[PDB]
Amino acid sequence: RSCIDTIPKSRCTAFKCKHSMKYRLSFCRKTCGTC
């Protein structure tokens, strides 16, 4: 499927990308560099 964050970009913080599986792999896949 398309590579897209499900929540607003401001929610996808570097901190959440580093420390939250939910954010990195569900909510912020584009911003966190998962896809």
List the structure tokens of 17: 């990308």
**How far, in Å, CA of 21 to CA of 35, rounded?**
14
Tell me the technique behind this structure: X-ray
Residues 6+ apart with CB under 8 A from 3: 29, 30, 34, 35
DSSP letter string over 1-35? -----SS-GGGS-HHHHHH-HHIIIII-TTTTT--
Residue 2 one-letter amino acid: S
**How far, in Å, CA of 27 to CA of 5, rounded?**
6
**How far, in Å, CA of 32 to CA of 22, rounded?**
11
**How far, in Å, CA of 16 to CA of 2, rounded?**
21
Which H or E run includes 21?
Answer: helix 21-22
**How far, in Å, CA of 29 to CA of 23, rounded?**
8
* Resolution of the structure, angstroms: 1.2
Contact 24, 6 (CB under 8 A): no
